[PDB]
């Protein structure tokens, strides 16, 4: 019961199972800014049950705790505004399952998703070694206030833009975007508008469009 891979040290004291945590399949969502990730509404209402309970008890809509648990068990029309008011500035720890270095746990801000899949900003994928061929990630909620500040000030995804192993940037643009740039900034010996003169980059885009 002590020794081995499944004793108390390696199985219950160094690594523990954890409340306020979730897990689902990832997908892209390229509209994101790189400090935020998409997080489904069903997972968001399950991970944030006590914050929603506290918010519901503050407004005065209900009285006892039971009433609030019936309200979110029924999922009425008023708890989604409560949920968008508990999400807003509250980071979450996304984590891909084989975490090898410290860039495999990064903190985002949730943006709620109609769906059942974590939308993860693409550049950040090169840090997680996360493709989208069936991968899964876990979300963890920093409960206390010092942990929200550690997620925003140390573990936020804007703060991890250089790999700690060296000086090389880890938010390097991976595959589609370098093809879009390499096709954009290139040249050919004859095209429409060869050798005309332009009074700025704004009318360069206006001539392209």
């Amino acid at each position: 019961m002590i020794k081995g891979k499944q004793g108390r040290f390696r199985q219950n004291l160094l690594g523990k199972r954890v409340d306020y945590s979730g897990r689902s399949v990832i997908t892209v969502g390229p509209y994101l800014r790189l400090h935020q990730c998409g997080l489904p509404k069903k997972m968001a209402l399950e991970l944030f049950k006590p914050f929603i309970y506290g918010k519901l008890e503050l407004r005065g809509l209900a009285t006892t705790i039971k009433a609030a648990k019936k309200m979110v068990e029924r999922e009425e029309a008023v708890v989604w505004d409560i949920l968008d008011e508990v999400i807003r500035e509250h980071p979450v720890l996304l984590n891909r399952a084989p975490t090898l270095h410290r860039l495999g746990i990064q903190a985002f801000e949730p943006v709620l998703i109609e769906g059942k899949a974590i939308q993860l900003h693409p550049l950040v994928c090169a840090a997680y070694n996360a493709d989208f061929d069936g991968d899964q990630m876990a979300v963890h909620v920093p409960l206390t206030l010092e942990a929200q500040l550690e997620a925003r000030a140390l573990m936020m995804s804007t703060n991890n833009i250089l790999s700690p192993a060296n000086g090389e940037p880890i938010i390097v643009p991976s595959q589609d975007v370098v093809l879009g740039l390499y096709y954009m900034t290139r040249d050919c010996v004859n095209a429409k508008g060869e050798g005309m003169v332009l009074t700025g980059p704004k009318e360069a885009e206006r001539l392209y469009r």
Partner: protein
């Protein structure tokens, strides 16, 4: 599959999921329940006059909760030969082997939505139900006599109000077929002395919906509620 290899036929026949005809001939096609094949005389025995009645296995549970289902692919009054197929199983189309479906695919980057290996799908794929698969879940409920008397199969579900007695009979167990979801009640199965009464009544798991397609009951010689047994 529009681009196959021709080995689809041998796999779909040789795996016994389709109802390959034993003796050739014509057809009577009652089929709602069974394909009825009249046998040509050369393949037909002198005694045992004989017409072959094939059993179609309709909607039932596979080992991976998928749906194994056979559908007749021959009409009424139509010649079939020995070794020919009659009923298409799961993932078969006229005796071939149809695992997935063939769709119009463009190779291009489209606004980042297919970044690493992702795939961007129109709404015409989801409107046509052309991947809408059917899963079947078996759920057991037993009322074993753990301790303090035996447990009981009654609708007279406690504490919980007229949110128990609903998808059931006038006095117990899920009726037959409705659109049950999560948190419903299927089989009222609770004991007294277990106020001190409780709710072990097997319910529907969290997050799933569905239609009760079948209810089996080889229960403790006595299950009859009123006089249904």
């Amino acid at each position: 599959p529009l681009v196959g290899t021709g080995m689809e036929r041998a796999v779909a026949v040789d795996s016994g999921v389709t109802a390959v005809a034993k003796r050739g001939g014509v057809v009577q096609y009652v089929d709602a329940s069974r394909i009825v094949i009249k046998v040509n005389e050369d393949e037909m025995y002198p005694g045992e006059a004989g017409i072959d009645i094939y059993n179609l296995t309709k909607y039932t549970r596979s080992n991976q909760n998928t749906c194994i289902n056979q559908m007749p692919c021959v009409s009424l009054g139509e010649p079939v030969e020995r070794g020919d197929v009659l009923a298409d199983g799961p993932s078969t189309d006229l005796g071939e082997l149809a695992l997935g479906q063939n769709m119009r695919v463009a190779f291009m980057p489209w606004n980042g939505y297919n970044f690493e290996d992702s795939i961007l799908v129109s709404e015409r794929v989801v409107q046509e139900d052309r991947f809408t698969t059917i899963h079947i879940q078996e759920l057991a409920c037993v009322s074993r006599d753990t301790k303090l008397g035996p447990e009981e199969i009654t609708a007279d579900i406690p504490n919980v109000g007229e949110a128990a007695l609903s998808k059931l009979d006038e006095s117990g167990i899920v009726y037959i077929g409705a659109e049950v979801t999560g948190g419903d009640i299927l089989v009222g199965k609770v004991t007294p002395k277990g106020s001190d009464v409780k709710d072990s009544s097997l319910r529907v798991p969290n997050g799933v919906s569905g239609t009760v397609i079948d209810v089996q009951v080889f229960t403790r010689d006595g299950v009859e509620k009123d006089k249904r047994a």
